[PDB]
Design a protein around this nucleic acid. Structure first.
Length: 389
RNA sequence: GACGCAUAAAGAUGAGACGCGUUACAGUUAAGGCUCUGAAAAGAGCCUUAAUUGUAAAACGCCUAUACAGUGAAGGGAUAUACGCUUGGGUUUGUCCAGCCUGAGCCUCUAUGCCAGAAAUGGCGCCUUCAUCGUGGGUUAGGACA
DNA sequence: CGTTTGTACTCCAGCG
DNA sequence: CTGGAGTACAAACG
DNA sequence: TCTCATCTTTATGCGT
């Protein structure tokens, strides 16, 4: 669930960024900085990289103080007033989704009929310790009051030197009194002492004039796969770079090897990225959502076998209903009427054979395994010759 | 031994951000190629590759306008609010979940931030209503039986 | 003899 | 890892 | 990468 959490975080971060840009745009247009002005362009471009602020910046990505200093420069040269600068800076520092962590995960008492955080019941946790000391109850209460009061620590040290308590007990007392007690207690206050689901791939591909391609950095192009590089000059340069540093097969050059091979360096000090042809894909796996073209591995949901007016079987792949509007290529246009439908992992048999197979990968001629007696080998049979068991 | 407490390490789950990468469109720069013009140097157009700048997209969908957000005013602010309790709802489907979001009523449990102040306290964040201005918001890349 | 299914083989997938 | 993709060669239906 | 919160398991003590 870690990767789904990361995708969810990327999605929500982008949504928050759309929220921040809209509010800034509305406010700047409300002042008089319409989108043609230089102040709108500068302040709006700075909002795409508003910086971090989780750590403090020393005295006089980027930190948010650097970004806000640039925003201050942009608005002062744009003749803005201090209230408008303050409101724009308020938009830069605004929190759009509420960060809620104080009371989220709750623990229930183990007794047969919510438990507090440990940091809120330090008195009870100290009372759990000092209740077993041999001294009287008035001294127990005085010790409990002295431990929790941060000024009376010397009295506690005097008590422990007097009564010769164990070092681990003194340790426990000071960690209950002082430390940041993360978590909740086992008991309440009355009882302390008593495969996959992704429709498409994450990186969009470029699909122009029938050619599927994408950009990869020079340090991401494996040695045996150099021929996918579209640029002739950089393909031969990368071939000579692989020949120079004795990369046999598999993984690529490192950062230092790529820089020493003479490749250009980008402004963020990464290596240049090359346009490469994408293998292992086809035009039938291409979907377009907004501007982006993606590969989908869930493009087929089943196989439909049709009987025409001549009584002859023909197989057509049933495409995914969730993606049918987004396929670039036209859908199947079957003649006649449907006879039967073959889903993935259905058990089938082959015309003229007695063995029982099951569909591993599907299509017009789906790929079938033997259920019993398969050595891991498979074979493809036309779906017109199959029938469901 | 069991249980509780404290410490430490590792892992998991949820939340919120900062960046890199990818893609689409537009601009700029460099290198190369093709074509036209010219007495020639070279001028111009198109294409490719790389770098660079800006803007936009990153589930499909479903639900929500009886919603969501901004601004201003007024009132409340521990005798309070909700991340809590009780009971519903959206995602949600063929059925059931998780996770997240959320309505109404409520304060038994749980939680309650930032700043100035030794402190009482105050001011913001927060809650409600009204006015005004807009069109926005939640959840979806995870499971189980079908 | 000319299409048309059918093996053999190789390649594909976001991350600090 | 699944659930495909393309390509080369080939053996089989019409 | 960073921040915030909780949970589980494994030790090592202490207490009943």
């Amino acid at each position: 669930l870690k990767d789904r959490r990361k995708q969810r975080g990327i999605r929500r971060t982008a949504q928050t960024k759309k929220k921040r840009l809209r509010e800034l745009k509305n406010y700047l247009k409300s002042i008089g900085y319409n989108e043609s002005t230089a102040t709108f362009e500068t302040v709006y471009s700075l909002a795409h990289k508003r910086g971090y602020d989780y750590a403090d910046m020393p005295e006089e990505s980027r930190h948010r103080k650097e970004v806000v200093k640039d925003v201050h420069k942009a608005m002062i040269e744009g003749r803005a007033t201090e209230e408008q600068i303050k409101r724009v800076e308020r938009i830069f520092n605004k929190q759009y989704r509420p960060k809620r962590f104080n009371n989220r995960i709750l623990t229930k008492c183990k007794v047969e009929d919510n438990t507090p955080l440990r940091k809120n019941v330090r008195d009870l946790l100290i009372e759990n310790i000092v209740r077993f000391f041999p001294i009287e109850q008035s001294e127990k209460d005085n010790l409990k009051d002295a431990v929790l009061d941060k000024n009376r620590r010397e009295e506690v040290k005097s008590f422990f030197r007097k009564h010769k308590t164990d070092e681990h007990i003194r340790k426990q007392v000071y960690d209950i009194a002082d430390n940041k007690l993360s978590g909740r207690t086992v008991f309440c206050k009355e009882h302390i002492l008593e495969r996959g689901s992704a429709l498409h791939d994450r990186n969009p591909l470029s699909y122009k004039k029938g050619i599927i391609t994408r950009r990869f950095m020079v340090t991401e192009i494996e040695c045996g796969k150099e021929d996918d590089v579209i640029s002739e000059t950089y393909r031969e340069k990368l071939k000579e770079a692989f020949k120079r540093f004795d990369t046999k097969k598999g993984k690529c050059l490192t950062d230092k090897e790529a820089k020493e091979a003479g490749f250009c360096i980008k402004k963020n000090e990464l290596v240049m990225s090359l346009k490469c042809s994408i293998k292992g894909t086809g035009p039938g796996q291409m979907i377009r959502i907004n501007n982006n073209v993606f590969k989908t591995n869930v493009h087929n949901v089943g196989v439909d076998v049709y009987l025409d007016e001549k009584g002859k079987k023909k197989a057509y792949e049933r495409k995914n209903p969730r993606l049918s509007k987004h396929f670039i290529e036209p859908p199947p246009q079957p003649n006649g009427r449907v006879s039967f439908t073959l889903k993935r992992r259905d058990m089938v048999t082959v015309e003229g054979e007695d063995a029982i197979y099951r569909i591993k990968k599907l299509g017009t001629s789906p790929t079938i395994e033997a259920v019993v007696g398969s050595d891991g080998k498979t074979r493809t049979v036309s779906a017109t010759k199959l029938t469901k068991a």
